[PDB]
Amino acid sequence: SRLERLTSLSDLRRTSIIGTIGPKTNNPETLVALRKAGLNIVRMNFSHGSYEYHKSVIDNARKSEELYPGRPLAIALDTKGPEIRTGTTTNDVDYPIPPNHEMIFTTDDKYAKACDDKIMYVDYKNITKVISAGRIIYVDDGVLSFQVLEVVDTLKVKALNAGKICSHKGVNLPGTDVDLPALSEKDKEDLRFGVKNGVHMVFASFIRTANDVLTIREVLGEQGKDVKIIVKIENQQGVNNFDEILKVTDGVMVARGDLGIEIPAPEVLAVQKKLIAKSNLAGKPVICATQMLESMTYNPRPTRAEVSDVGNAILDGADCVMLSGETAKGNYPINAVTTMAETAVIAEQAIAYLPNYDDMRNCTPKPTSTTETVAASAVAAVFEQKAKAIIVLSTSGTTPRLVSKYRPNCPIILVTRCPRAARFSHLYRGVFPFVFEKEPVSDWTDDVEARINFGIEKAKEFGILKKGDTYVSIQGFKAGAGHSNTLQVSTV
Amino acid sequence: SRLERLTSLSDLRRTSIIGTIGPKTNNPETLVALRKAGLNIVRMNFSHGSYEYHKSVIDNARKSEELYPGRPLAIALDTKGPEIRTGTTTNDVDYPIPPNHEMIFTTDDKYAKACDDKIMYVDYKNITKVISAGRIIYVDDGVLSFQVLEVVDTLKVKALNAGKICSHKGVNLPGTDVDLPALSEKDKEDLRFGVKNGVHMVFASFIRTANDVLTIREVLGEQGKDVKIIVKIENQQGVNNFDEILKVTDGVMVARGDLGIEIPAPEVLAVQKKLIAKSNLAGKPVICATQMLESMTYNPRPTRAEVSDVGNAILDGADCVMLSGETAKGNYPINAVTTMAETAVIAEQAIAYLPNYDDMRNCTPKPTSTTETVAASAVAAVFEQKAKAIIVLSTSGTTPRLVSKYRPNCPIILVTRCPRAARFSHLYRGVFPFVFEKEPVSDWTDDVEARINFGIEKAKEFGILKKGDTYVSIQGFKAGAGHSNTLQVSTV
Amino acid sequence: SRLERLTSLSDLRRTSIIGTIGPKTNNPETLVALRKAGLNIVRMNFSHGSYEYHKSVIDNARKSEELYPGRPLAIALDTKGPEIRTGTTTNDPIPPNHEMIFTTDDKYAKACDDKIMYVDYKNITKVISAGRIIYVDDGVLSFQVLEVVDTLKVKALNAGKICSHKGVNLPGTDVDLPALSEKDKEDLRFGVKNGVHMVFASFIRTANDVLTIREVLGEQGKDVKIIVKIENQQGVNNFDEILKVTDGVMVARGDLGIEIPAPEVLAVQKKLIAKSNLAGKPVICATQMLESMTYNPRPTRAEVSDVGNAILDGADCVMLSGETAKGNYPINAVTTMAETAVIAEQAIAYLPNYDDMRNCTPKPTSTTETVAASAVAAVFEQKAKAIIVLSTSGTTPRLVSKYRPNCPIILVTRCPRAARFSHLYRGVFPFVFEKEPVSDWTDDVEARINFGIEKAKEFGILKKGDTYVSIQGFKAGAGHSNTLQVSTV
Amino acid sequence: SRLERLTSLSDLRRTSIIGTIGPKTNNPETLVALRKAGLNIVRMNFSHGSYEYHKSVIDNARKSEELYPGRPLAIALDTKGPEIRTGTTTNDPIPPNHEMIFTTDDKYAKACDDKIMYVDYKNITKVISAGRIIYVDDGVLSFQVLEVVDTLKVKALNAGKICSHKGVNLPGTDVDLPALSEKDKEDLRFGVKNGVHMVFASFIRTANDVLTIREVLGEQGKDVKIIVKIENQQGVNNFDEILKVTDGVMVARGDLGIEIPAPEVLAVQKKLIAKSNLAGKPVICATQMLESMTYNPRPTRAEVSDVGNAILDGADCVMLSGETAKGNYPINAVTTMAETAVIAEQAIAYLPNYDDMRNCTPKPTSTTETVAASAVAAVFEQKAKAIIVLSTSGTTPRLVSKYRPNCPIILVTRCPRAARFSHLYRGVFPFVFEKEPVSDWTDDVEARINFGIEKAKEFGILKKGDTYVSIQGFKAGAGHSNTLQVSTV
Ligand SMILES: O=P(O)(O)OC[C@H]1O[C@](O)(COP(=O)(O)O)[C@@H](O)[C@@H]1O
Ligand SMILES: O=P(O)(O)OC[C@H]1O[C@](O)(COP(=O)(O)O)[C@@H](O)[C@@H]1O
Ligand SMILES: O=P(O)(O)OC[C@H]1O[C@](O)(COP(=O)(O)O)[C@@H](O)[C@@H]1O
Ligand SMILES: O=P(O)(O)OC[C@H]1O[C@](O)(COP(=O)(O)O)[C@@H](O)[C@@H]1O
Numbered sequence A, B: 001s002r003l004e005r006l007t008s009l010s011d012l013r014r015t016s017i018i019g020t021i022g023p024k025t026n027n028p029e030t031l032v033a034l035r036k037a038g039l040n041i042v043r044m045n046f047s048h049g050s051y052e053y054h055k056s057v058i059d060n061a062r063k064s065e066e067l068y069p070g071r072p073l074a075i076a077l078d079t080k081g082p083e084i085r086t087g088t089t090t091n092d093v094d095y096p097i098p099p100n101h102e103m104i105f106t107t108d109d110k111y112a113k114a115c116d117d118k119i120m121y122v123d124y125k126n127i128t129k130v131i132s133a134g135r136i137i138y139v140d141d142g143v144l145s146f147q148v149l150e151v152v153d154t155l156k157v158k159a160l161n162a163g164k165i166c167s168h169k170g171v172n173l174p175g176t177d178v179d180l181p182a183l184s185e186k187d188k189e190d191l192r193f194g195v196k197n198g199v200h201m202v203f204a205s206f207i208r209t210a211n212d213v214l215t216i217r218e219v220l221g222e223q224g225k226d227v228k229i230i231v232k233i234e235n236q237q238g239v240n241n242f243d244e245i246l247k248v249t250d251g252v253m254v255a256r257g258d259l260g261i262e263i264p265a266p267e268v269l270a271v272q273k274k275l276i277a278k279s280n281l282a283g284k285p286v287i288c289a290t291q292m293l294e295s296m297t298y299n300p301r302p303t304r305a306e307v308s309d310v311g312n313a314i315l316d317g318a319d320c321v322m323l324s325g326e327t328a329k330g331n332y333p334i335n336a337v338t339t340m341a342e343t344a345v346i347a348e349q350a351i352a353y354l355p356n357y358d359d360m361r362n363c364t365p366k367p368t369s370t371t372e373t374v375a376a377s378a379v380a381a382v383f384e385q386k387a388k389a390i391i392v393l394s395t396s397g398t399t400p401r402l403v404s405k406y407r408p409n410c411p412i413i414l415v416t417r418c419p420r421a422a423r424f425s426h427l428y429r430g431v432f433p434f435v436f437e438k439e440p441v442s443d444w445t446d447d448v449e450a451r452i453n454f455g456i457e458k459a460k461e462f463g464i465l466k467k468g469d470t471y472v473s474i475q476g477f478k479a480g481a482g483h484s485n486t487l488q489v490s491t492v
Numbered sequence C, D: 001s002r003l004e005r006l007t008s009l010s011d012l013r014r015t016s017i018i019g020t021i022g023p024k025t026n027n028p029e030t031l032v033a034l035r036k037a038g039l040n041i042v043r044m045n046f047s048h049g050s051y052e053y054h055k056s057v058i059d060n061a062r063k064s065e066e067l068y069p070g071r072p073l074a075i076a077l078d079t080k081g082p083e084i085r086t087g088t089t090t091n092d093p094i095p096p097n098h099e100m101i102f103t104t105d106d107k108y109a110k111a112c113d114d115k116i117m118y119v120d121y122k123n124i125t126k127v128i129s130a131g132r133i134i135y136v137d138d139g140v141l142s143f144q145v146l147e148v149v150d151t152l153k154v155k156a157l158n159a160g161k162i163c164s165h166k167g168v169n170l171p172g173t174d175v176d177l178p179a180l181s182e183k184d185k186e187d188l189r190f191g192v193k194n195g196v197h198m199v200f201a202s203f204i205r206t207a208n209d210v211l212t213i214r215e216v217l218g219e220q221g222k223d224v225k226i227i228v229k230i231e232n233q234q235g236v237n238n239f240d241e242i243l244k245v246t247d248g249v250m251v252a253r254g255d256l257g258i259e260i261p262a263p264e265v266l267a268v269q270k271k272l273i274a275k276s277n278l279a280g281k282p283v284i285c286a287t288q289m290l291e292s293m294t295y296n297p298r299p300t301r302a303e304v305s306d307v308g309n310a311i312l313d314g315a316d317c318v319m320l321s322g323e324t325a326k327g328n329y330p331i332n333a334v335t336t337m338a339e340t341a342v343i344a345e346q347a348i349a350y351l352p353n354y355d356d357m358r359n360c361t362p363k364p365t366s367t368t369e370t371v372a373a374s375a376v377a378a379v380f381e382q383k384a385k386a387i388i389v390l391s392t393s394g395t396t397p398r399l400v401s402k403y404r405p406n407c408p409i410i411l412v413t414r415c416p417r418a419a420r421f422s423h424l425y426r427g428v429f430p431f432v433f434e435k436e437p438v439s440d441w442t443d444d445v446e447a448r449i450n451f452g453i454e455k456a457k458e459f460g461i462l463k464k465g466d467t468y469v470s471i472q473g474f475k476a477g478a479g480h481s482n483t484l485q486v487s488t489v
């Protein structure tokens, strides 16, 4: 009874909070305070900044752990996909305000650093081929709308709305199949660099076809592997073929920011709810991002609509809710994060777990897979015994994942030896990674146990588990290729 | 969608078939053929017959196993509770046919062997105190209706319907709180006798209050214990206080035969569906009995209504469907049994398992108990992986019970060392007992395993498990007082 | 849900009780007492008896109404379809497992015994082949065609004596017999002549069968509804295309359990009965629903269970066969049925069931069905003690019965046949209006609607200040139900 | 279910868009363009502006209809409840964490600065005590009452300059202020004088509050609906008894997020909005639904999300505050809203939601509610492209809106106020009928019903040969909806 529940409306937040680190936050002290607020994954927007502009963050991040461990600080690498950008005005951020006048658009660098009013540049050197008369072109957050009057290349366009034409802004051209590659020559260097410094995840930008992901996979190369690929659905194609994409990727990212530019902004409300849902089904994790608290970028107080977005994104099924420029330059970073976390606590506090689990477990099996079967079965026991926690050890993150899907109204303490897994594990809601240093003991029967009890302790530390409580353990033991198949309902 | 399923309508029968053995069936050869048809539990109506009249069956039964093991033949003891009975006519089964005339009813033995027309006897020596004018009294299958005109004791009554007044028939007096004990002086001797020869279960007759069961419990004494108590709801009181009764008993028995006499026959249709359901909830097993195939008592062909009753009783949730005089004297015993089993296969073939499990698991937990939590969780996995069988070892029958409650669309192979448990285990639908003789090996970790694999073999023997199938194992391992808490999703 | 309700378990019975009238019941006085118990439709098994053997019942029935109206006594005509039957013995013989000849040349028709026996199916020699089994008399004697010699050779399988003129059920054989025989038609023309409300067509297999029974009923037919009796396997195989044309089906258990393994009839029933509720067509469950009562005033536990369950499955009608067509306890049987029927429909899940029914629909629904559903909807909301619906074709009160309301469906009508066969629908309570139409299709229908209210008030169905829903039409020209009226009594 | 639908994701927007009119929008031309975008109800924030500052809007609004009718432009009156406000600085001051005095004796009212500051609440010295926090201006500056000295001592907690005449929100303090002030009433009497359709009562706490706003609206009031604005904690605590009397509530996020922790407003909303759908009373979600659009033609992802979600929660109305009362992009904001609204209600679960709604009912339902539900029921069945309903009190079209149909609810009416505030209900499309009554309550209602059909046909709402349901009454004397009519176009 959605109505009954809704009519009738503490625990530890279970949804990650990705944070884009900018100059103003690029320092252990701050980087720590951010993590103290609730920062988990760290976004690395490679759209701006040099290899040192980032290699500086990767270290400061690692520092924050040193200064104070807390929770396995993750480090993501947001590739600067195939994006277009305008050139530079004649002399610094000018104020040329087009009201509805037409003008030329070149791509021969000749005016790259002098474009103004009677002219303007664009990154896409081949735009003259992809774009044709009639095409609209949004510029800067999709503000200025242009209308290609005629390709003359040097193509002719015409403003539609006012607004001044500034320097180096995004050039979104919806309705045009750009012949650009999701991975550029430079893009790869960033990946090889990321895997070099060991970035846990990579938020691939502007994906369209599965092949795209595939490439990001073979480009990540041998070193990649452990690094998960997060496809960022930014255009229409990443929505059209988002199904075949969803298959290969490791998780998708609701790229609202540029999404709302490609497809009509109001559609992003439906496209989100869908993608986020299409992901929970597949089991792959999903991150909702952009302007989740834009106002907090210049204010310690978020607007009603803002917090609503946060929570709703979560209530939709979002696994991760990230902060962009809100912390990458905002005058209120720690405050933003905090507001998020606080909102996140309530969001997942007004969710329908029992039924939702049914729905999730109903669009399955066919039949399910062994590890998924016990994952579901594991969550099942929770609702029955009313388990205060479900301990699960894993090395590939797989198990704790499938466990997160059938989302339990309790925490999913994942004990592990691997340091990367426990890091990107944050990519899953409800998961609480904990690294085990104690090298294996003697048996895959005493070790796993000592590991299981370990989880119990850490849980007890987090208050997650009271004195004489109840809990479920998830471990495997299949002839040779053991891979989760056991369930253990125990008491604390 | 009950409609969808119903619109759209092999496996091993999963519902026991209790059989009352009579002279015509009191012989290994026959007793075997009966078991070959599908006979499981063996009813011992102690209403008629001497200690040798029964001690003869207990052995012949044991013989059938010798001649041919098959399936652990169970032996139940149906106590002849506090029932009333008419005396004997003047000279043998006379034909005195009362049309609506009145007559005297005595209790001083003086006419006990000469009662006829102008007189008739009744067992209840104290009936003169419990019954008062206005009370109706049914005689023989509730055929002859009398109407106590006035207590003269020697109480005056009057026929209401025709029918001849035969010798030694049942005297059902609905609407009268008889001061009789559910356990008589002789009744106990039968119990001590049963436990002496080791009767697995006891179908207590004419229960009314919980206390009744309690007594049958302390009377069973030390030797009892392992023997389960099956309360037979025969009057109104066993329905009124059937809730407090349901608490203590080990299972109830829908005593239709005399039920339909106490409460209006048409109500038995609702009282059944309710009790049977109130039992599935409690987890206690339930048996539906009497006239389930009365016609087969004199015919090799059952009436449409008959098979319907069988199946429906099962579809209601019945755990056991027994045969009374149908095999205790019927001219077609093996045929009756067969018809039952065949009907039983279809009945459980048109059941809604997935949803029913939800309903069952929804009127729970609060929270559930550890062994119940894994039982439910166990059944859960089944529906997911589509397990062809669920192996569960237990010594008290408890676990396989709770597993049977959340009823899986697959067999519940129970491996055990105990010989009694595996016998009365038949009292639960879906259960397939299998005794293990191999004394324990070395560890509660290698033994249980060797036991688990044992189950797999027997299952493979029964065809229950194909080559590369899937299955779930249920075992315990709780600090000291281990008692089921582990689940194992494996492949065959 | 189901568990809660089941865990937790007066109104007027809403399920008809068809009754096969036999010599012992062929008399107004009795025929009345039967109706007094709860008899509604009257079965006319044309398998046995001459045109006077029945024309006598049709009148006695009509008499019972005269002696005492009560409830519009219906009269059904059970055709004696393409059934096979054995000949007559030498002079009025227990086979143990011996073989014997089976002829079809009349030569031994009145002398068949042991070393020989007759069968109606003259063409059986063509349809049956070696290996085929043949049940005789209630499916007791099982034979095994050793070889077609015709004059085909068979062999007993079970004991039992071989009596005269019994049924010859040959399961697993596609008989080339017609669902309607030359004589069969005469019975139909006769029935429509005396005006039989419904006809229980016997041994149907294909839709075509029904079609024939339709064009044979002819012009006079029309108003008479066709009830297909599913007795073999084909009436189950093609029961879907059949269900389309027929007006309702009849779970022919008796011979069904002979054609298909008896235990399957438990599933075949539940299915057909359900496949019918969906289609909206009425369904009747029959045979041995109280066989024991045929020789006893007390029914067995299994018996009453069948009655109620049949109802709880979704059955619209539960008939009594030889239980009243010769049984030593007719009125008693009926009574036991009705009483059982009251409880059965007393433990039903109406709100949810309506949802299920209304969920396997629409697509979208039809106007009259749309308001029928909508009508039942209002009931559950206002908790209406009754839903008044006037109709002349029975259609509306039908679609209303489908979405089955936990309340009575008082149908007011002018037509006398409709109000009779209307009993074929559960929950329906027909009431004939004699008052010729007044002046307007707006004052008349009203005077009609209020009429329903009165009769309801008479039956106690409607208390003083109660609530009720009215169903009437008013569509441009071709008006045909589309209006709903939530009112107070 | 939810997963399948969500996995799988034109019609006329069905959710109103209230708009607060400010100087920049106070002109027919603009006021029209706003209505052209999708503006319906018009908010009149009486917090700022003189009786002419508003009497000017009431006319310009009325003008927009003249210039171009379109859709019955509604006019709401947002009372400026018991709000507190700071005084004026010395001559038109950034506290970092320093303490300071707070007076209430007017002496410093026009000179308060740094070492002092004023507050409206003259009795604040009694309600507030040491330890209490006090937010100022959009809840930016947080103070901490060090000690009541009155003239109470406080201390800044955050930076920010201390400007003149800003709001003084003191969460956690039961203010003894009246929901209706001496001046407040004058505004009401004024509103009812110029005929304001609805009144958004501000800062309600107890039912009594509403009651007062009811007897203050007086005789002239009546037709004017009272919309309680839940702004503090008490309007949430006793929001249940309030919900009983009021005509609808307003999720007062803006000040709500100040009283209760901002993150809680996400749960408080979903609850209230839901607690309202149940009661049947309409609900409006407001404040910052597109704050960014106040200075931009492009809304942020979070913004549109809020709009739609607010709708998807069950919101009946989504208003725009300063977004159009001063924003540099008014028409654009409205547009973005409407567009978002179209998709929101396009991804809703109607069939099931109706079930849920109709399941937390009846008990039993009321006659007009019973047919309202029943009416919506038929829609889902026949797949009606529209449901015509005539009413004069708005009641019926309301109860019809509750059980929310996936189709438009064309309400035909004679009353001009009803058809105006009727916008307060989602799915409703008011249409005034000028044609004075004909001769019968049977030909008139009809001519009225067909009228609805035409207007519907005009809006494209109804295709050629479509299907539709009509809702009308006819109960003995006190007729008040009880009839349903499933018809074809
Ligand atoms: O990491 P995954 O893919 O979820 O697999 C979990 C694995 O970890 C275990 O629980 C323990 O394995 P190890 O002892 O090798 O760490 C296995 O039983 C199971 O195969
Ligand atoms: O018989 P129950 O009551 O169901 O208990 C089952 C018990 O059997 C086991 O599965 C195996 O125990 P044993 O090795 O002693 O036979 C235990 O783990 C569990 O406690
Ligand atoms: O269900 P049916 O048999 O079509 O009857 C419904 C008809 O009866 C009425 O309610 C009344 O019409 P009549 O006066 O002709 O009986 C019509 O409005 C409607 O078309
Ligand atoms: O919902 P409301 O405002 O009570 O209006 C419904 C009323 O309008 C009607 O449909 C038509 O009556 P009027 O001509 O007076 O408007 C009545 O039958 C019904 O009582």
Ligand SMILES: [K+]
Pocket: C045, C046, C047, C078, C079, C080, C081, C202
């Ligand atoms: K017949």
Ligand SMILES: [K+]
Pocket: D045, D046, D047, D078, D079, D080, D081, D202
């Ligand atoms: K205000």
Ligand SMILES: [Mn+2]
Pocket: A205, A234, A255, A257, A258, A259
């Ligand atoms: Mn982007």
Ligand SMILES: [Mn+2]
Pocket: B205, B234, B255, B257, B258, B259
């Ligand atoms: Mn008994």
Ligand SMILES: [Mn+2]
Pocket: C202, C203, C231, C252, C254, C255, C256
């Ligand atoms: Mn037949």
Ligand SMILES: [Mn+2]
Pocket: D202, D203, D231, D252, D254, D255, D256
């Ligand atoms: Mn406010």
